[PDB]
Amino acid sequence: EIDKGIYQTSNFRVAPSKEVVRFPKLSTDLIKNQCVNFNFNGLTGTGVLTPSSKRFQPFQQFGRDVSDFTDSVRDPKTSEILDISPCSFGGVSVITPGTNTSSEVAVLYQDVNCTDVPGNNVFQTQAGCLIGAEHVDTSYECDIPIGAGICASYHTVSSLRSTSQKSIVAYTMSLGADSSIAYSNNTIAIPTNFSISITTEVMPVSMAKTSVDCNMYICGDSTECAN
Amino acid sequence: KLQDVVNQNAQALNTLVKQLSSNFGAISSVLNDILSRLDPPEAEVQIDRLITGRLQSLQTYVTQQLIRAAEIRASANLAATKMSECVLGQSKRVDFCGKGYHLMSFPQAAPHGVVFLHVTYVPSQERNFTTAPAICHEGKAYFPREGVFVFNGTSWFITQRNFFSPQIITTDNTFVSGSCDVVIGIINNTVYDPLQ
Amino acid sequence: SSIAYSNNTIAIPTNFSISITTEVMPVSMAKTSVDCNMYICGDSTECANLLLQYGSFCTQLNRALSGIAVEQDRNTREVFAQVKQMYKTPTLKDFGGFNFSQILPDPLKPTKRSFIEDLLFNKVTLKFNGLTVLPPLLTDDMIAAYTAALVSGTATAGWTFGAGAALQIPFAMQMAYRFNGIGVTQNVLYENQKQIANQFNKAISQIQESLTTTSTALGKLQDVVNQNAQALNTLVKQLSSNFGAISSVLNDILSRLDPPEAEVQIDRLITGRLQSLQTYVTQQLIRAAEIRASANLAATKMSECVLGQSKRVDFCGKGYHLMSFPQAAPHGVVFLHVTYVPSQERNFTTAPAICHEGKAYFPREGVFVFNGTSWFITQRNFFSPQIITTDNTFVSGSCDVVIGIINNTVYDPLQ
Amino acid sequence: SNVLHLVQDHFLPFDSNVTRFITFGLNFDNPIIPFKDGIYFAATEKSNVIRGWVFGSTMNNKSQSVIIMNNSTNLVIRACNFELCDNPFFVVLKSNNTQIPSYIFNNAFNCTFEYVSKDFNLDLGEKPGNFKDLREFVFRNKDGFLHVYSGYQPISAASGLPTGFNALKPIFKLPLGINITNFRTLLTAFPPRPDYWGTSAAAYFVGYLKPTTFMLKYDENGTITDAVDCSQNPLAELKCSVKSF
Numbered sequence A: 001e002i003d004k005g006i007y008q009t010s011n012f013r014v015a016p017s018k019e020v021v022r023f024p025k026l027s028t029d030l031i032k033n034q035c036v037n038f039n040f041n042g043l044t045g046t047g048v049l050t051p052s053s054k055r056f057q058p059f060q061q062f063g064r065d066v067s068d069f070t071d072s073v074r075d076p077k078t079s080e081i082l083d084i085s086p087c088s089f090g091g092v093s094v095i096t097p098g099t100n101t102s103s104e105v106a107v108l109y110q111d112v113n114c115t116d117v118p119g120n121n122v123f124q125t126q127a128g129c130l131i132g133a134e135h136v137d138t139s140y141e142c143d144i145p146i147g148a149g150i151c152a153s154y155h156t157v158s159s160l161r162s163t164s165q166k167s168i169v170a171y172t173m174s175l176g177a178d179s180s181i182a183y184s185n186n187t188i189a190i191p192t193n194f195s196i197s198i199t200t201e202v203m204p205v206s207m208a209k210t211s212v213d214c215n216m217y218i219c220g221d222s223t224e225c226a227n
Numbered sequence B: 001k002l003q004d005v006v007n008q009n010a011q012a013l014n015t016l017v018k019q020l021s022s023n024f025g026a027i028s029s030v031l032n033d034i035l036s037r038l039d040p041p042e043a044e045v046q047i048d049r050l051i052t053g054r055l056q057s058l059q060t061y062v063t064q065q066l067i068r069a070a071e072i073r074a075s076a077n078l079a080a081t082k083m084s085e086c087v088l089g090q091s092k093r094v095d096f097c098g099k100g101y102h103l104m105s106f107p108q109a110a111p112h113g114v115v116f117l118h119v120t121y122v123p124s125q126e127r128n129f130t131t132a133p134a135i136c137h138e139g140k141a142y143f144p145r146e147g148v149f150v151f152n153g154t155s156w157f158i159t160q161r162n163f164f165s166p167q168i169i170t171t172d173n174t175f176v177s178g179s180c181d182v183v184i185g186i187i188n189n190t191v192y193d194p195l196q
Numbered sequence C: 001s002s003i004a005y006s007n008n009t010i011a012i013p014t015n016f017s018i019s020i021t022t023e024v025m026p027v028s029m030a031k032t033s034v035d036c037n038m039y040i041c042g043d044s045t046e047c048a049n050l051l052l053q054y055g056s057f058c059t060q061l062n063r064a065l066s067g068i069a070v071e072q073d074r075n076t077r078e079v080f081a082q083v084k085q086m087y088k089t090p091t092l093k094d095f096g097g098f099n100f101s102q103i104l105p106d107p108l109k110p111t112k113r114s115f116i117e118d119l120l121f122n123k124v125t126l127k128f129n130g131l132t133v134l135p136p137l138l139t140d141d142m143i144a145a146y147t148a149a150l151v152s153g154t155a156t157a158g159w160t161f162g163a164g165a166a167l168q169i170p171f172a173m174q175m176a177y178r179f180n181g182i183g184v185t186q187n188v189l190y191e192n193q194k195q196i197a198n199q200f201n202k203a204i205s206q207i208q209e210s211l212t213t214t215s216t217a218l219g220k221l222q223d224v225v226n227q228n229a230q231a232l233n234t235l236v237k238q239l240s241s242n243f244g245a246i247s248s249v250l251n252d253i254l255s256r257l258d259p260p261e262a263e264v265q266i267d268r269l270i271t272g273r274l275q276s277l278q279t280y281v282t283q284q285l286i287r288a289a290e291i292r293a294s295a296n297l298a299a300t301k302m303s304e305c306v307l308g309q310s311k312r313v314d315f316c317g318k319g320y321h322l323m324s325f326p327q328a329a330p331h332g333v334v335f336l337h338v339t340y341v342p343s344q345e346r347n348f349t350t351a352p353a354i355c356h357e358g359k360a361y362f363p364r365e366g367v368f369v370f371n372g373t374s375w376f377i378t379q380r381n382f383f384s385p386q387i388i389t390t391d392n393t394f395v396s397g398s399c400d401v402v403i404g405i406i407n408n409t410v411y412d413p414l415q
Numbered sequence D: 001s002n003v004l005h006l007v008q009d010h011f012l013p014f015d016s017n018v019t020r021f022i023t024f025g026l027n028f029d030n031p032i033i034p035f036k037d038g039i040y041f042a043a044t045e046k047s048n049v050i051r052g053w054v055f056g057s058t059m060n061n062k063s064q065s066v067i068i069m070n071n072s073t074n075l076v077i078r079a080c081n082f083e084l085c086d087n088p089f090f091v092v093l094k095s096n097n098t099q100i101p102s103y104i105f106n107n108a109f110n111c112t113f114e115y116v117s118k119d120f121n122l123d124l125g126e127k128p129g130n131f132k133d134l135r136e137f138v139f140r141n142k143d144g145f146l147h148v149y150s151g152y153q154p155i156s157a158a159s160g161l162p163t164g165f166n167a168l169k170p171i172f173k174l175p176l177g178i179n180i181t182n183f184r185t186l187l188t189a190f191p192p193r194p195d196y197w198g199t200s201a202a203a204y205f206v207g208y209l210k211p212t213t214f215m216l217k218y219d220e221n222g223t224i225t226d227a228v229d230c231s232q233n234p235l236a237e238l239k240c241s242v243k244s245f
C-alpha cells in the first residue's frame, strides 16, 4: 500500500543513438544534435554533439570546462570544432494518491523536456515533464509538491459535466484567501463578541535510547575476528 | 511529528541490520562460512574487508543518530521553554502559546513528547464605527487613556480596543495635555464633569 | 566614558529619534540530490555490480538529501506563510504622512516586488555528474506576494491581524498605541506627528541609499550560497583523483586492463568516491541543521516583531521596538525594525517621595523632578513636566520612613 | 574560457636573474652555454643577427647535435653527428648583406634527424632603428621530445629586456631522443672586409627554466592574459591560495 505523495522511484537516462569514430579501424564521421558515442582521436564519450562557438587557438583542439570537463573537440579526420554537452539524465518520481483512494498514478521526469520522454497528456513544467496530470487553471491549497509553485491533487476535472474521472490535476499554488479590508482615515473596527479557542501543539521530547555493541555487529562472536 | 522520529529511528536500525548480510568484496557474507572455507592466512584477507564494511556502516549510523539527537534536543529545549512560559504563566509573546491572546495552557503526555492545549481569546463579530484622535471641549484637547473615542451615532463614547463597552466621557477617562490647535484630527465634543 | 552615580540626580531624555535598522537572516538552502551510480560508476556495467555488494549505502545517502530538501521547504513555509488572508496593497501609499512607498510593491513597475526587495535581489550575485538542483517549491515572486501581504496588512490593520480577525485602524492611532506601548504617551505623537513622519521617511530613504551602493552588508545570505557551491565544487574535483589506482577514469582502467585486477582497481576507485559522497552528505546535514535553527529564529522574529510589538530587549532592534517590516531576499528574509531612541538628556534633581502634611506621596507612572523652581512629575522616557496632584500621586504612610523625602505641597484640584 | 588555471610545471620565474650575451658594436661572442632542464632564449635584433642554435651532448663525433638555421630561405632542421668546429658563426657581409659560406660543421657523419624546412625570402643584413624585434624561444625535454615554444614582440628595447607580459605558442614537438647537455647560439658577424669581422647593434639573453607553480589566466579567447608566480612573493603564494588576482 502506498500513501499520497511524490515518491522518487528510480532514475532516467537517454541512450545514445549512433556510434561515431574518427582517426587522423575506420571512421563514421559525424552525427549532430543526438546523444552519440563520439570517439575523436581515441577519446570516447557519450554526449550530444553540437557545433562549437568560440574561436580555438590553431593548436588547441579540445575545449575544457571549469571542472576540467571537455565541452569541445576538434575532428582528427575532417576539420571542425564541435561543442560537447551531456545527454539528459533525471530521476523519475511517481505521484500517486493514496492507494486506498485509487491506483491511478502520474510520473514526473525531474529535469527533462517532454521531447526526450519515451500517459495521454504531458505537461512541461520547470521541475520536469509531468505525464498523466491534467493541467487546470483553477487554484487550491497545495496537496502534493511538484515545485516551481505547482502542486498536484486528486480532483474532479469536469470532463463532461463532471464524469467523476477524478484524475490527477496539476495546478499553480494558491497562497491563501483574498481579503477585503480598506484603509479609512476615521473608521475603526471594534469587536463586539469573543470566542474561546483551544488548540493543540505537539512537540517531540526524546527518542529511543539505543545501544549498539561494536564487536557483536562487526565480528558476530568470532574468536579469530576482532584481532 | 512524534511518529516521524520513531519512523526515522526504526529505518536507521533496520538499514543497519540489513547492511550486515552483504559481501564487501568478500567471498561470503557470514563470518562463520569464511572461517570454515578458508585457512586463517587467507581468511584474514576476507575478514578485514568485512570489518571495514561493518565499521563504515556503524560510523554512518552513529553520525546520523548524533545529528538527529541534536535536533530532538533542540525541540525539547523549546518544549521546556513553552512549558515554563505558557503553563506556569501568561505569555505576552505573539503566537508563542496558541493563536490569538493566551489565557491558559495545559500539558498532556504523549509517547516521547508533550502536547500543549492552549486556550486563547479570539475577538469576533466586529462593528465598524467612526473615530477621532481626541476631543477639544473648552479650548483644551482631551486624549483618551486606555481606550479609543468612538461615535455610535447619538454621542461620542470611549471604549477598550478589544471589546465594545460604551461609556460616557468624563474627566476621569481623559487627560488634557495641550491645546486644540496642534492635533491633526481634533473633533469637537463636551467632556462631562462629574463634580459640577 | 564618565558616568557619575549621584544619590540625588536623574537624567531624563527630552528629545528622540525614529531609527530603522536592517537585520539579515538566511532561511533556506539550495536543494540538491545525487545518484550514486552516475557519480561513482560513471555509466559502466562492470561497476554498479560491485556496488551491489556494498549493500544499501545509496538508499541512505539519497534519502538523507531528500530529507534536507523537504526541511528547506518547511522552513520557508514556517517563515513567510504566517499571513492567513492576502491583503492587497492599497492604492495610496501615504498613511498619515508616513511614506510606505519603498516597502510596498509598485503597481506601475513590472518586477512585482518592492524597491528594497529589488535592490536586495540585485546585490546578492549568484548538468555535471549525477548532481541535480531541485527547484524550490515557492517561487521568488510568491514569497514576494507573502511579504507584500504582510506589509499591507500591518500598514492597514496594525497588531490585530496577527492574532484573530483583521481590524482596520488609521495609522495615526496605530502608531499612537505603539508609542503608548514603550511608555511614551499619546500626546507626544499626536503633537509630533509631522516630525515623526519626517524622520520615518528619512530613515527609509537612508536604508535605501545604504543598500543602493556597493556595500556588502548581505554576507549572511551569500555564505549559505558560497559554502554550498564550494562543497558542490569539491565533490566534482574528487572525480579526478586516482586513489592509488593507475587512472581516475573508470573506462580507462577497464579498457587498459584485463578484468581480474581491473576489478581491484575499480574497487579502489569505488571506495574513494563512496568516501567522498559520505563526507559531502555529512556536511550537508550539519549545514541544514544550522539553517533550520536560523529559520526557526527568523520565524519567531516574524511572529513577534512583525505581527505585534515585542517588548523583549534588543530582540528585534537596538532600541524600543515599534514596528517591523519583513522583506524577501535570495534564500532569506530581511527585517526592517523601527526603534524609538531617546536623546538629548537633561540633568535634574529628584526625591523618592514628597511630604505634604505628615504624609508621604509617591508618584505613579512617573518620577519627581526639580526643574529649578518647583517640583513636578514626569514620565521617565520623555520630558513632559506635570504639576503634582492627588491624581498623579498616591499617599501611603508617614514621612519618616522614606530616605530622601523632601518638603513640597500636593495640589488637590477639587477643593 | 574565462578561467584561472593552476599548473606546476617548468616555467621561467617572474623577475629572474637572467644572463645577457651581447653581440653589438665591435665585439662578438660565440660561447657554449649549459642547457639546464630547459632554457629561455631571447633574440633582440634588427639585422636578423641570430639564426639558430646548436644543441649537443659530447662534441666528440659520438653525440647527436641539432642545428637549425633560420636565415632567410635556407632553413634546415638537421640533427647530425660531426666534428664541432670552434667558431661556426654565420657570416652576413657588411654593406653587402649577403651570407658568406662558413662551415657550420667540419663534415656530416650520422644525421639521425633530417627535416627540410620551407624556403622563405627574408632580410639578413644590418637595418636602421632600434632592435625592436624580440623572438622568444623556450625549450623543454620530455621523453626525447624537445618542445619549442616561440613568441614575437615588437616592443621597444632601449636598455634591455622590457617589462610586460605575453605568451609563446608550441610550434614544434621534435622527437630527438638524445641527451643534450650543451646549447650554443648561432650568430652572424658582419665583416667590413675579409679577416676583420664585426657585429650589429643587437643582443641575446639566456635564462634558465625552473620548476614552479603558475596561475595562468586563460581568457575568453583562450589566450593567457596574465599569470602569477606563486613562489615569487608571499602575497603571490596567497594569490595562488585564493586564486583570485
Ligand SMILES: *[C@@H]1O[C@H](CO)[C@@H](O[C@@H]2O[C@H](CO)[C@@H](O)[C@H](O)[C@H]2NC(C)=O)[C@H](O)[C@H]1NC(C)=O
Pocket (backbone or CB within 6 Å): B152, B153, B154, B155
Ligand atoms: C447610541 O448610544 C445611545 C446611548 O446608549 C443610544 O441611546 C439610548 O438607546 C436606548 C435604547 O433605545 C434607550 O433605552 C436609551 O434611553 C437611549 N439613551 C438616551 C440618553 O436616551 C442610541 O440608541 C445609540 N444609537 C445607535 C445607533 O446605536
Ligand SMILES: *[C@@H]1O[C@H](CO)[C@@H](O[C@@H]2O[C@H](CO)[C@@H](O)[C@H](O)[C@H]2NC(C)=O)[C@H](O)[C@H]1NC(C)=O
Pocket (backbone or CB within 6 Å): B186, B187, B188
Ligand atoms: C469647534 O468649535 C470651535 C468653537 O465654535 C470652532 O472654533 C471656531 O473656528 C472657526 C474656523 O476657524 C473660527 O472662525 C471661529 O472664530 C472659531 N471659534 C472660536 C470660539 O474659537 C472650531 O472650528 C470647531 N472645530 C471643528 C472641528 O468644527
Ligand SMILES: *[C@@H]1O[C@H](CO)[C@@H](O[C@@H]2O[C@H](CO)[C@@H](O)[C@H](O)[C@H]2NC(C)=O)[C@H](O)[C@H]1NC(C)=O
Pocket (backbone or CB within 6 Å): C014, C015, C016, C195, C198, C199, C344
Ligand atoms: C529633536 O530632534 C529633531 C531632529 O533634529 C529636531 O527636528 C529638527 O528641528 C530643526 C529646528 O526645529 C529643523 O531645522 C530640522 O529640520 C528638524 N529635523 C528633523 C529630522 O525633524 C527637533 O526639533 C528636536 N526637538 C527638540 C524638542 O529638541
Ligand SMILES: *[C@@H]1O[C@H](CO)[C@@H](O[C@@H]2O[C@H](CO)[C@@H](O)[C@H](O)[C@H]2NC(C)=O)[C@H](O)[C@H]1NC(C)=O
Pocket (backbone or CB within 6 Å): C093, C094, C097, C098, C099, C100, C101, C102
Ligand atoms: C514617497 O516616497 C517616494 C520615493 O521617494 C516619492 O517618490 C519620489 O518623488 C520624488 C519627487 O516627487 C522623485 O524625485 C523621485 O524620483 C520619486 N521616487 C520614486 C521611487 O518614485 C513619493 O513622492 C513619496 N510620496 C509621499 C506621499 O510621501
Ligand SMILES: *[C@@H]1O[C@H](CO)[C@@H](O[C@@H]2O[C@H](CO)[C@@H](O)[C@H](O)[C@H]2NC(C)=O)[C@H](O)[C@H]1NC(C)=O
Pocket (backbone or CB within 6 Å): C371, C372, C373, C374
Ligand atoms: C520651572 O517651572 C516653573 C513653574 O512651572 C516655570 O515657571 C512657569 O513657566 C511657564 C512657561 O512660560 C509659565 O507659563 C508660568 O507662568 C511660569 N510660572 C511661574 C510661577 O513663573 C519655569 O519657567 C521653569 N523653569 C525652568 C528653568 O525649568
Ligand SMILES: *[C@@H]1O[C@H](CO)[C@@H](O[C@@H]2O[C@H](CO)[C@@H](O)[C@H](O)[C@H]2NC(C)=O)[C@H](O)[C@H]1NC(C)=O
Pocket (backbone or CB within 6 Å): C355, C405, C406, C407
Ligand atoms: C518639612 O516640614 C516639617 C514641618 O514644617 C518639618 O518638621 C519639623 O520642622 C522643624 C522646622 O522648624 C524642625 O525644627 C523639626 O525638627 C521638624 N520635625 C519635627 C518637629 O518633628 C520637617 O523637618 C521639614 N523637612 C525638611 C527636610 O525640611
Ligand SMILES: *[C@@H]1O[C@H](CO)[C@@H](O)[C@H](O)[C@H]1NC(C)=O
Pocket (backbone or CB within 6 Å): A100, A101
Ligand atoms: C480506505 O478508505 C475507506 C473510506 O475512506 C476506509 O473505510 C478504509 O478504512 C480505508 N482503508 C485504510 C487501510 O485506511
Ligand SMILES: *[C@@H]1O[C@H](CO)[C@@H](O)[C@H](O)[C@H]1NC(C)=O
Pocket (backbone or CB within 6 Å): A113, A114
Ligand atoms: C525545452 O524545449 C523548448 C522548446 O524546444 C526550449 O525552448 C527549452 O529551452 C527546452 N528546455 C530546456 C531545459 O532546454
Ligand SMILES: *[C@@H]1O[C@H](CO)[C@@H](O)[C@H](O)[C@H]1NC(C)=O
Pocket (backbone or CB within 6 Å): A180, A181, A182, A184, A187, A189, B128, B129, C168
Ligand atoms: C466598516 O469596516 C468593515 C471591516 O472591514 C468593512 O467591511 C465595512 O465596509 C466598513 N463600513 C463602512 C466603510 O461603511
Ligand SMILES: *[C@@H]1O[C@H](CO)[C@@H](O)[C@H](O)[C@H]1NC(C)=O
Pocket (backbone or CB within 6 Å): A185, B184, B185
Ligand atoms: C484624512 O482626514 C482628513 C481630516 O482629518 C480628511 O480631510 C481626509 O479626507 C482624510 N483622508 C482621506 C483619504 O479621506
Ligand SMILES: *[C@@H]1O[C@H](CO)[C@@H](O)[C@H](O)[C@H]1NC(C)=O
Pocket (backbone or CB within 6 Å): C009, C347, C348
Ligand atoms: C550635568 O551633566 C553633565 C554631563 O551631562 C555632568 O558633567 C555634570 O556633572 C552634571 N551636573 C549636575 C549638577 O548634575
Ligand SMILES: *[C@@H]1O[C@H](CO)[C@@H](O)[C@H](O)[C@H]1NC(C)=O
Pocket (backbone or CB within 6 Å): C007, C008, C403, C404
Ligand atoms: C547623598 O550622599 C551624600 C554624600 O555622602 C550625603 O551627604 C547625603 O546625605 C546623601 N543623600 C541621600 C538622600 O542619600
Ligand SMILES: *[C@@H]1O[C@H](CO)[C@@H](O)[C@H](O)[C@H]1NC(C)=O
Pocket (backbone or CB within 6 Å): D219, D220, D221
Ligand atoms: C577575442 O578576439 C576578438 C577579435 O579581435 C576581440 O574582439 C575580443 O575582444 C577578444 N576577446 C578577448 C577576451 O581577448
